[PDB]
Structure formats: C-alpha cells, structure tokens
Design a binder for this molecule. Structure first.
Ligand SMILES: NC(=O)c1ccc[n+]([C@@H]2O[C@H](COP(=O)([O-])OP(=O)(O)OC[C@H]3O[C@@H](n4cnc5c(N)ncnc54)[C@H](O)[C@@H]3O)[C@@H](O)[C@H]2O)c1
Ligand SMILES: NC(=O)c1ccc[n+]([C@@H]2O[C@H](COP(=O)([O-])OP(=O)(O)OC[C@H]3O[C@@H](n4cnc5c(N)ncnc54)[C@H](O)[C@@H]3O)[C@@H](O)[C@H]2O)c1
Ligand SMILES: N[C@@H](CCC(=O)N[C@@H](CSCO)C(=O)NCC(=O)O)C(=O)O
Ligand SMILES: [K+]
Ligand SMILES: [Zn+2]
Ligand SMILES: [Zn+2]
Ligand SMILES: [Zn+2]
Ligand SMILES: [Zn+2]
Lengths: 373, 373
C-alpha cells in the first residue's frame, strides 16, 4: 500500500520571507491523484510574486513551484492512464477533457478544479502536505519545490521517458507560453513582421515561435541591453531599447516598419507597454497579444479608434495549449530539435541553494534557473 | 465639356446649429473625379456626431451626408469605368484597388485619399463646393446633402439600375456596417450566443447579420425600450434594459448566459459601454467588436486579465467591406431578398425638411429617415 512519505521541501512559512528547506510528510494519493517525485524544478517571477505577498490569492504556509519534471511514484484509485515510473510534468493549467472549456477548441482554461486549486487544496478539498504539525498548502496545483508532491490526475502530462528532466521542466511554464503565444494565439503567417516587448524566458520563447512560423522580421524590445545578444541568438532580427528614444516606443516601431508590425507581443506585464504594443501594430490588421501578467488593479487603455481602424487586442494563457495533449508533443518537438529548451537555462543550483534562484531573478542576470532536487 | 452646376444643398455653416438650405455651386469633375446627382440620402448618427463638434476632424462650413444614392451626372479626365447615367452609391471608404491596404484581404481601409478626405477636400487638395463666395468643405468624401456632389473616382460603387434608390442609399453606411460587423469582423459561427448594445440602425443590422450567420441567442440591449419591438422582429431572442438592473450590465449578461456571450457588438459610441460589452463576453473565447464612434480623446479600458483569460477586442469600419467590390453585391443580396433594407426606413421627408431628420434621431423616434432630394 502507499504509505506517507517523509522528505524535504522548500516551505514558504510567511510572505516576504525566504524559502526554508524543511522535513515534511507527504500523504499518499487519494482517488484520482498521483504522487510525483520531482527531479528538477525552475523558478519563475510568478513564484516570486506569490512569495512577496502582493498576490491577493496567496496563502501561507505553502509549497511554491510550478515548473517541474519528474517521475510517477504512485497513483490513487481510479487512475488508469498513469502508473508508477512514468516520466511526467505537473500542470498548473489542467485538462480534464470533459468540462465546457476542455470541449471547446478555442480555449485551454479547464475549470474542473480551479476553485479548490486557488485555495491550495486537492479536489477533495484537503491538502496532502504537513510540516511540524501544521498543514502546508499546495500551490498552482503543482507544488514543484518538494522532493515529492501530489497533483490531481488531470494535472499530469506523460512525456518521452528519454527527455532530460532538468531541461524539460521548463516546458511547465515560460517556454510553452511564449512559443504557444506565437503559434497558437497569433498564428502569424510566414513572412510577417513581429515585435516582442520583454526579452526574458517568455519573450525569447515568443521569438522562437515567430522564427518557426517564418517571420520575416522579429524586433526585440527591452530596457535591458544585456538581453539583446541571446534574443538575437533566438531569432530576433534586431533589438531596440526604449530608453534610447525620446518618442513613444509605438512611434519608433511604426517608423521602423512603415505602418507598424503585423503582430506584437507584450511579455512584461506592464499596462503602459501593453498599450504601446497594441498601438505599434499596423493599422487595419495588426494584432497584439498580451502574455504578461499585470499587477492586480492595473488596467489597459487606448482610443477605440485603434480597434475601429483594424487593430485587434488579444491575450494568452500558457500559450493556449491544452496541457495534457500538448506538453508531450512539445517535449517531442524538443527531442526533434524543432524547438529549443537547453538554451533557456542560464543557471543550475542544488535544492539547498534554492533561494539564490530568486536572487538571480532580481539581478536581471537570468532567464531560467534549474534547481536539481 | 462639363459646366458648373447651380443647385440646392444643406449647408452646415457652424456646429451646434441646424442645417441651411442654400443655393450653391458645384464645380465639374476634375481628372479622376465623378459628379453624382443624389436622388436620395439619409442621416447616420455619425452625421450628427460631427455636427455637434465631438469629431477630431470636424471642420466648418461643410456639407455632411454619407448615406446616399443617385446617378452619375458626369466624369472627369481618365474616368473609364464610370459613365453618365450609371446608378451608384458614394463610398466614404474607397477602394483604389492597388494600395498596400486594398491588396491585403485582412482589411478594407484604403488610404489613398484618407488624408485629403479628413480635411474635407478632393484628392487634389481642393473643394468643389462654394456658397455665397465662401468655399464649402466636403465630408467623408461623399457630402450627400446636396442635389449634386463630386467624389473621387475610387469612392464610387456601380450598382443595379433596378435598385430603388430611396432604399439602397442606406447601404451607404449603417446597414452594411452592422451586417459586416457580424459577418466579416466577428465571422460568428452558427449557434453562437450574441449580445448587441445599442439597437439603432447599426444594431439592427448587426442582429440581422447574426441571424443570417445562424446565431442561437441574440440579446438586444438598449436604454430605450421602444427599440425592443423592432429588435425582436429582426431576430433578437430577447431584450434587456440596463436600467432595470442594479448590477452592471456585464454581470447581468454573464448571469443570463452562464459565463458571457460568444460575441458582443457596441453600436453606440459609449466608451464605458464598450468596456461592458467586452466584459460581457465569455471567458476563453469571447469576442467583442466595437462599431460605435467615440468622442475625441475618450478611451476604452479594462484589466488585461480579461484578455489574458481568453477575450478578444476588435473594431470595424463600414463592416469591413471592400467598398467597391461589396456594395454592388450587397444591393444584389437586397434584391435577392437575402438581407433587409426597407425595414430600416421609419420616416421619409423632402429635402427642405431635412433638419426634422436630425430631430427624430435625437428624439430616438427613428432608425433611418430617407430624405427625397
Ligand atoms: N500568460 C501566461 O500564461 C504567462 C505565463 C508565464 C508568465 N507570464 C508572464 O510573462 C511576463 C514575463 O515573464 P519572464 O519569465 O519572461 O520574466 P522576465 O522579467 O525575466 O522578462 C521581462 C523582460 O522585460 C524587460 N522589461 C521591463 N520593462 C520593460 C519596458 N518598459 N520595455 C521593454 N522591456 C522591459 C525586463 O528587463 C525583462 O528582461 C510576466 O508578466 C510573467 O508573469 C505569463
Ligand atoms: N464603424 C462604423 O463604420 C460605423 C458605421 C455606422 C455607425 N457607426 C456608429 O455606430 C453607432 C450607432 O449608429 P446609428 O446610426 O445606428 O445611431 P442610433 O441613434 O440609431 O444608435 C443609438 C442607439 O443606441 C441606444 N443607446 C444609446 N446609449 C445606450 C446605452 N447607454 N445603453 C444601451 N443602448 C444605448 C440609443 O438609444 C439608440 O437606440 C454610432 O456611434 C455611429 O456613429 C459606426
Ligand atoms: N474621426 C474619428 C473617427 C470616426 C470613424 O471611426 N469613422 C468610421 C466611419 S463611422 C460611419 O458613419 C471610419 O470610417 N473609420 C476609418 C477612419 O476613420 O479612417 C476619429 O478620428 O476618432
Ligand atoms: K469567428
Ligand atoms: Zn513560471
Ligand atoms: Zn476541463
Ligand atoms: Zn455612418
Ligand atoms: Zn487602396
């Protein structure tokens, strides 16, 4: 039978404090849940956002992390598709396959367990984590910052058993989102001119997709010149820094493309930049995709004349991928060298140095840091 | 050759005042210009919008009117495809047929003469109108409030001679716009749930459009409940008055539709309503098309979350119709009984009493009033 597991995990006891490697107990999978052994996990600004305490939905104590890869240790009752030993990737965006959203081709926002997930609990409404007698909450339905975690069976993607987990763990968030943003949400046609605001993991993943889509031009935009080199490596035909212009960045791009870009992508989370990204699109057919997440309360704006004159405002969630179906495929494209992953890893750390991941992130000296459990 | 024409026209000397029946002069067609004898014309809200001054490019004195129909009185040098006697409709949105835009299937916004047109002048930078020694400006390139008008030769649609001009003149704007907002911009699929804000001429044309597309639920929304009766006759499954509810109209719609409409259309020009229309859309795939023209400087807004979670903001002009190609086909669809036009005419007046047409519109008593020249 499946027993309780005593393992280590980086607990976030309180907002605004660093993570604490702690000894915890992980309960066995209940019906339609699977316990996974995380081999590798990366850190994203999203983890940091909840850690700061600025997140209205963030609760503590909790186990963060939503970018991991690992192996199925065991499954609860009712679980057929998965078995102990399967190589997998936890999914913050699930795919039950039967809800209103899963059944609609135009979205991937499965709602079967959203409510319970926002509260950091399994579908049965209870947490599977305990530490020093206290209950520790789940996070984004994944909690990848533990040697062992439990997720809803509808939150797992079975992937190629040969995929390096300390690499592929990044398909859990940033790469898939950026890539899908270009290929799924925008569906840019070969030869189109694109602009990308923000050159972090997401922006680079976007550039990657524009390049596979056959974009004729791909303009990178970032206030951090250091990001340019790698962007060019990814496919950016040219990079520009807003700080080097006195005119609004929209006007700059319009000049550079004789009207504006065919597609633009905001990968920062800055409401003002989002407006610029929209306005920088070509009149009559320009499309702008918002990929970045703005701080609660903040809102976007522009003159309706912009939409009336042909521009379209869009957005994306996890690159619009139906998680369970897509991720295994994305892994295969990686194995086939169709897409890049290794190139997104800028730093590697052991589980104890996990806090340094957050530090590298603020330094801006980082795209993605993979933490070996 | 062609001589000057001494005729009658409704001149608007200054904003915020009723038009003035004046005896003007109309110069002959210069190279690539066409002089049209207007047989019938109506009043779109956009005409009043300009007459009030809220137009970013409203200059006076000017001869308004962009919904009309008549006969080609004569043509200027180089005009081959159009001859005297041709039954035509003046287009405020041209189709040069060769610019960057005309060649792109994703738009209908020819820019060939947009600049000059915005200033109320012919392509050569001059006006063909004069009254009491003072030069009078064109409007939207059509100026249909005159017995005779001169337009660019790329602002002319040659239609079926048999078409009743006192009817199809409405296809010059309102009807075609609303209809296309649904068929071209939204391209709504059969069975989709729709919401239409503003049940005027444009709104009913939107409903008519949703109906032909095979929409399931079509929810009309208007503060003037007297608009409901005809809305339902056009296809609205039901109407709701925003005032009869304490909750913001978005929540009402979200509640009625178990999440929001698949498509919404703002046909009023209210920036706050435009935001509601977008937020009334369903998560993951909702699309909102802005059709109404907003007052200078005003902007629409919302939390980017709305876009990130699946909703799309679009806009349209003249329903996205390639004017010179489409209008002729549109009157054909009217002739074949495929779309309605006659049911839009609620009043009829002579030229001398054109101001009454404006009063009725501000009174909300009409949809469209055809003024017999
Ligand atoms: N929609 C989704 O599903 C989804 C998924 C993951 C992440 N995100 C969001 O994507 C955004 C980016 O994530 P990331 O990992 O790539 O983060 P990142 O911080 O590493 O990338 C952002 C880049 O934007 C640059 N930048 C900041 N202000 C700028 C400005 N005014 N103009 C141009 N560039 C500017 C920064 O220097 C940085 O290089 C965040 O909002 C993240 O939360 C969304
Ligand atoms: N994009 C285009 O090409 C295009 C074309 C034609 C018209 N327009 C614009 O579309 C709008 C409608 O034009 P029209 O000729 O049909 O005028 P209209 O007077 O017939 O439309 C106004 C209708 O909306 C209703 N309405 C006003 N405020 C409302 C509110 N707060 N909530 C619900 N309903 C409200 C009015 O009572 C009336 O029923 C105007 O802004 C017009 O300028 C745009
Ligand atoms: N002058 C306004 C724009 C007004 C506007 O949107 N006009 C529509 C037709 S409304 C039908 O009566 C249009 O043709 N848009 C395309 C364009 O104006 O180039 C403003 O500047 O805000
Ligand atoms: K569609
Ligand atoms: Zn992340
Ligand atoms: Zn689902
Ligand atoms: Zn109009
Ligand atoms: Zn053109």
């Amino acid at each position: 039978a499946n027993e309780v597991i005593k393992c280590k995990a980086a607990v976030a006891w309180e907002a605004g404090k660093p993570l604490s490697i702690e000894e915890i107990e992980v309960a066995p999978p209940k019906a339609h849940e699977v316990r996974i052994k995380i081999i590798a996990t990366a850190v994203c600004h999203t983890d940091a956002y909840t850690l700061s305490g600025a997140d209205p939905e963030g609760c503590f104590p909790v186990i963060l992390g939503h970018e991991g890869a690992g192996i199925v240790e065991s499954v609860g009752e009712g679980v057929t598709k998965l078995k102990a030993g399967d190589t997998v990737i936890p999914l913050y965006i699930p795919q039950c396959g039967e809800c209103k959203f899963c059944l609609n081709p135009k979205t991937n926002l499965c709602q079967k367990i959203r409510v319970t997930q926002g509260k950091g609990l399994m579908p049965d409404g209870t947490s599977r984590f305990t530490c020093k007698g206290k209950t520790i909450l789940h996070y984004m339905g994944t909690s990848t910052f533990s040697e062992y975690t439990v997720v809803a069976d509808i939150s797992v993607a079975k992937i190629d058993p040969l995929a390096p987990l300390d690499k592929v763990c990044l398909l859990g968030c940033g790469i898939s989102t950026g890539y899908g943003a270009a290929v799924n949400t925008a569906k840019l046609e070969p030869g189109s001119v694109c602009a990308v605001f923000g050159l972090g993991g997401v922006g680079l993943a976007v550039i990657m997709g524009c390049k596979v889509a056959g974009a004729s031009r791909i303009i990178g935009v970032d206030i951090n010149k250091d990001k340019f080199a790698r962007a060019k490596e990814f496919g950016a035909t040219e990079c520009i820094n807003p700080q080097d212009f006195s005119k609004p960045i929209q006007e700059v791009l319009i000049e550079m493309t004789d009207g504006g870009v065919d597609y633009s992508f905001e990968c920062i989370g800055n409401v003002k930049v989002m407006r610029a990204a929209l306005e920088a699109c070509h009149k009559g057919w320009g499309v702008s995709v918002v990929v970045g997440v703005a701080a609660s309360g903040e809102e976007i704006a522009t003159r309706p004349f912009q939409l009336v004159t042909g521009r379209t405002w869009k957005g994306t969630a996890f690159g619009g991928w139906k998680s369970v179906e897509s991720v295994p495929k994305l892994v295969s494209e990686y194995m086939s060298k169709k897409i890049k992953v290794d190139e997104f890893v800028t730093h590697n750390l052991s589980f104890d140095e996990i806090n340094k991941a957050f530090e590298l992130m603020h330094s801006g000296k980082s795209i993605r840091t993979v933490v070996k459990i």
